[PDB]
Write a sequence for this structure.
DNA sequence: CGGCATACG
DNA sequence: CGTAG
DNA sequence: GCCG
């Protein structure tokens, strides 16, 4: 088992679901306390289990697996022995974990804001609504639409949104394309949002495109909230005799950068962090969603496809459905 | 022990 | 500070 | 929390 998640296929569904979910609780809780190092280890350990070809049934099978030390192995051991890990359950029912989870899940609220609110004694969404003066417009939108935003987005929703986004993109710039990215491109059947990447085959023509797209969507009455090259919106999506709010991300990239932006926005989050860590520490190259930089020769790699980027990095190609780290 | 990805709004 | 993957 |  390779040590980096970008070195191994990770499918969406796998054979160690309960074990990975428990480790991801501890990863999430570490993040709520500001321990990014422990978050990463628990995240990576969970991902290793997702990449295994069969269920872990005995502690023996953890020997030699990367990112499994005393702590993560003890968690697995207790789940194998008793069906439950005391530490995980303690986190699950803790007021701290439940409130930080509820607060951080609000669009516009991060760990730092949630932690300050928790220390001030706030615990519920209605606690936040009673004092709008402290909220940002982004937070007021996140709380107003929180219920809809907690409802899964389905594939049917995605196809309708894509058609509507394409319509506005086509008027903003004939020839521009819209590509579905994010978790749906990795094969997920549901999601908490929809991600689109927009480009144009003639380098430079995409300049200034996103404001034109947004104004067109705004004039169609489809934008419940919006704030450039990245736009984090809340869309009004038709429903049976009504509608629901849906988070939509729109991103523009010139065609020269499109493979890097496609790679980055297709995820997963852990996959991209591991890919960038691998790039820098193993290959000495600096990777982001704009390009891949050789800091010795001071040159950018030209890529025409995601396949090109994997080749540049000496990695076997992984389709999006195997990037579910 | 130091590192832990790297951007934009 | 928030956002993204 | 784990790796190198
Ligand atoms: Cl840490
Ligand atoms: Cl970037
Ligand atoms: Mn026991
Ligand atoms: Mn997404
Ligand atoms: Mn840019
Ligand atoms: Mn998104
Ligand atoms: Na949030």
């Amino acid at each position: 088992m390779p040590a980096y998640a970008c070195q191994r296929p990770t499918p969406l569904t796998h054979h160690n679901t309960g074990l990975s979910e428990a480790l991801e609780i501890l990863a999430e809780a570490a993040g709520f306390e500001g321990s990014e190092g422990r978050l990463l280890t628990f995240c990576r350990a969970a991902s290793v289990l997702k990449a295994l070809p069969s269920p872990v049934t005995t502690l023996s099978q953890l020997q030699g697996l990367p990112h499994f030390g005393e702590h993560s192995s003890r968690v697995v051991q207790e789940l194998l022995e008793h069906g439950v890990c005391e530490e995980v359950e303690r986190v699950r029912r803790s007021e701290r974990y439940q409130t930080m989870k509820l607060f951080t899940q609000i669009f516009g609220v991060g760990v730092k804001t949630a932690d300050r609110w928790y220390r001030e004694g706030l615990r519920t969404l209605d606690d936040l609504r009673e004092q709008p003066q402290k909220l940002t417009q982004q937070q007021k939108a996140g709380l107003q639409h929180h219920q809809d935003l907690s409802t899964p987005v389905l594939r049917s929703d995605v196809d309708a949104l894509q058609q509507v986004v394409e319509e506005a993109v086509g008027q903003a710039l004939p020839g521009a394309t819209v590509t579905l990215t994010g978790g749906f491109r990795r094969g997920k059947l549901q999601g908490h949002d929809v991600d689109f990447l927009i480009t144009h085959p003639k380098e430079g023509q995409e300049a200034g495109l996103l404001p034109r797209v947004m104004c067109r969507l705004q004039d169609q009455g489809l934008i419940l909230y919006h704030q450039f090259e990245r736009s984090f919106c809340i869309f009004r999506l038709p429903q049976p005799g009504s509608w629901k709010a849906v988070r939509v991300d729109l991103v523009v990239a010139p065609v020269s950068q499109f493979p890097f932006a496609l790679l980055g926005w297709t995820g997963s989050k852990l996959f991209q962090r591991e890919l960038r860590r691998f790039s820098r520490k193993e290959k000495g190259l600096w990777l982001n969603s704009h390009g891949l930089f050789d800091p010795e020769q001071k040159t950018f790699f030209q890529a025409a496809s995601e396949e090109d980027i994997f080749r540049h990095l000496g990695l076997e190609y992984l389709p999006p459905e195997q990037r579910n780290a």
